Design a protein around this motif. Structure first.
Motif, mmCIF file in Angstrom:
data_model
loop_
_atom_site.group_PDB
_atom_site.id
_atom_site.type_symbol
_atom_site.label_atom_id
_atom_site.label_comp_id
_atom_site.label_asym_id
_atom_site.label_seq_id
_atom_site.Cartn_x
_atom_site.Cartn_y
_atom_site.Cartn_z
ATOM 1 N N UNK A 91 8.864 10.728 -35.434
ATOM 2 C CA UNK A 91 7.994 10.663 -34.204
ATOM 3 C C UNK A 91 8.275 9.853 -33.144
ATOM 4 N N UNK A 92 7.839 9.982 -31.943
ATOM 5 C CA UNK A 92 8.567 8.446 -30.910
ATOM 6 C C UNK A 92 7.370 8.393 -30.465
ATOM 7 N N UNK A 93 6.626 7.028 -31.504
ATOM 8 C CA UNK A 93 5.856 6.748 -31.050
ATOM 9 C C UNK A 93 6.333 5.573 -30.496
ATOM 10 N N UNK A 94 7.536 4.628 -30.268
ATOM 11 C CA UNK A 94 7.169 4.088 -29.656
ATOM 12 C C UNK A 94 8.743 3.422 -29.040
ATOM 13 N N UNK A 138 14.799 16.437 -34.150
ATOM 14 C CA UNK A 138 14.281 17.015 -32.803
ATOM 15 C C UNK A 138 15.063 17.985 -32.059
ATOM 16 N N UNK A 140 10.149 15.567 -30.521
ATOM 17 C CA UNK A 140 9.379 16.211 -31.679
ATOM 18 C C UNK A 140 8.646 16.882 -31.809
ATOM 19 N N UNK A 191 5.384 12.601 -25.967
ATOM 20 C CA UNK A 191 7.112 11.320 -25.837
ATOM 21 C C UNK A 191 8.288 12.735 -25.542
ATOM 22 N N UNK A 237 13.507 2.758 -31.623
ATOM 23 C CA UNK A 237 12.817 3.013 -33.923
ATOM 24 C C UNK A 237 11.417 3.919 -33.855
ATOM 25 N N UNK A 238 11.654 5.666 -34.283
ATOM 26 C CA UNK A 238 10.915 6.748 -34.700
ATOM 27 C C UNK A 238 10.521 6.470 -36.353
ATOM 28 N N UNK A 239 9.153 6.751 -36.437
ATOM 29 C CA UNK A 239 8.287 6.890 -36.935
ATOM 30 C C UNK A 239 7.563 7.432 -37.818
ATOM 31 N N UNK A 240 8.159 7.550 -39.346
ATOM 32 C CA UNK A 240 8.262 8.593 -40.498
ATOM 33 C C UNK A 240 6.990 8.707 -41.642
#
Lengths: 129, 129
Positions: free
Chosen positions: A4-7, B28, B46, B53, B81-84
């Motif tokens: 995810x593009x969270x930041x 992506x 995503x 975003x 940075x990306x979240x998982x």
């Protein structure tokens, strides 16, 4: 499971100034403010999306950062871009709050854009979407 | 009316390589691919959030960009940075696809992180959230 593009991030010269500007003028809300050594992990979010993508207002103390920022500003290049529904309205609101614009709202074809000084060493683009 | 955090960026050395890596390895999806002079406006999203975003995979041709990227990589600093949800799983998946990691999943307290080479001149952080 997918990433995810969270930041996203902007490098600011002074985090207290940045907090004041990004929240007080631009209208972002503080999401996280946590000490980490002598600086903070400081993120903000849009009021429209408090659980969405966060913007990290991070220090510029690494030796390569300020030269890079300066180069972008010297060529009018924004460090980051935010979307708004009515750029005319937002230009007028922000101007009224004493925000400095380097580019007034300008029709670029598919988007209308404006560019503002964040006070923190960056130019910031508004994009009409 | 409020401004939205709709876009973030990474500077890539070669957009075709970046398209291949970010879509083919990281998972992506291409959102926009539009020519603008000799380069492209190329964004990805995503799969979990196709209307959220967007990440812009932008050229590194400005003279200040590559020196900045190189400085970050030399100090192990990620450009983005990306979240998982499950970093172990994702480390294993990406490793299987021949992605190079400079830092294996490591417990940092509030987050577990890993750092990968995007092939495009950046380190990319995965963060377990």
């Amino acid at each position: 499971n997918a990433m995810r593009i969270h930041l996203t991030n902007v490098f600011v010269d002074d985090q207290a100034k940045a907090e004041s500007f990004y929240t007080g003028k631009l209208g972002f809300l503080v999401k996280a403010d946590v000490p980490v050594g002598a600086d903070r992990w400081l993120t903000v979010v849009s009021p429209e999306a408090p659980d969405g993508t966060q913007l990290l207002l991070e220090p510029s103390s690494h030796a390569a950062v300020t030269p890079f920022k300066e180069a972008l500003v010297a060529d009018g290049i924004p460090a980051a871009s935010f979307a708004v529904d009515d750029i005319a309205a937002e230009y007028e609101r922000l101007s009224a709050l004493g925000v400095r614009f380097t580019q007034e709202p300008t029709d670029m074809g598919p988007v209308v854009t404006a560019i503002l000084d964040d006070t923190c060493g960056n130019l910031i683009q508004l994009m009409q979407i």
